Inverse folding.
RNA sequence: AAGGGGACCAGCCUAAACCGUCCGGCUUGUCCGGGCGGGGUCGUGGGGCCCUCGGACCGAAUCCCCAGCCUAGCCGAAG
């Protein structure tokens, strides 16, 4: 199924390009998240340089990504979690980590964009990349304590 | 089944192009979408749009009135 990419993508295409995908990919992942739209003839006519209106949005969020690459890149996130001095009783999730950063540093961050494969269960200092924009990574230190 | 002989007899309205108007969208306009109005209905192809020459008859399956008919009856020859 042909789609119009509203956002840049990795190893797939570029914003405004018409690409071919399996229908399950488009209807269950790409379209519901806004990453693409159906390449219907109405949309194709409606593509009134929609890339230009989409290249601006990507540039708009690329102003804050670098801007937040200073306030949110000059801090260590310290969160105290109940533990037996070695192992956390519960865990720290991306929402919990984002809650700490928005309540101990006053900067909102999308918990989904954090690159955290599995929640943290062991006390220690952790580093992960916050990636709100392609080619603009933001490494962030995390500290969890008793 | 076609064909032949008879009964009966009648053909119409829409979608789409294009034009207007109201409402919604934000990917804010020659934009898309949803109502409604106009326009259009065909096989000898037809229609839309542009240019030219053009420019009263037919008539309901709808409505109105009347005839007739139905639901009680009456007159009716001569031991
Ligand atoms: Mg016959
Ligand atoms: Mg009509
Ligand atoms: Mg149609
Ligand atoms: Mg309309
Ligand atoms: Mg109409
Ligand atoms: Mg024709
Ligand atoms: Mg009698
Ligand atoms: Mg009598
Ligand atoms: Mg008698």
């Amino acid at each position: 199924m042909k789609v119009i990419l509203l956002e840049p993508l990795e190893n797939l295409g570029d914003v405004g390009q018409v690409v071919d995908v399996k229908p399950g990919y488009a209807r269950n992942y790409l379209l519901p998240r806004g990453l693409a739209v159906l390449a219907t003839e109405s949309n194709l006519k409606a593509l009134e340089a929609r890339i230009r209106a989409q290249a601006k949005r990507l540039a708009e969020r690329k102003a804050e990504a670098e801007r937040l690459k200073e306030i949110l890149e000059n801090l260590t996130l310290t969160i105290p979690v109940r533990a037996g001095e070695t192992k956390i009783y519960g865990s720290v999730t991306a929402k919990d980590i984002a809650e700490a950063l928005s309540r101990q540093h006053g900067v909102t961050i999308d918990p989904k964009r954090l690159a955290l494969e599995k929640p943290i269960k062991e006390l220690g200092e952790y580093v992960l990349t916050y990636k709100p924009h392609p080619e603009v990574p933001i490494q962030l230190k995390v500290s969890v304590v008793a």
Remarks:
- DSSP finds four helices and eight strands in chain A.
- The CA atoms of residues 80 and 145 of chain A lie 5 Å apart.
- The longest helix of chain A spans residues 50-71.
- Residues 6, 37, 42-43, 45-50, 52-54 of chain A lie near RNA strand B (CB under 10 Å from a C1').
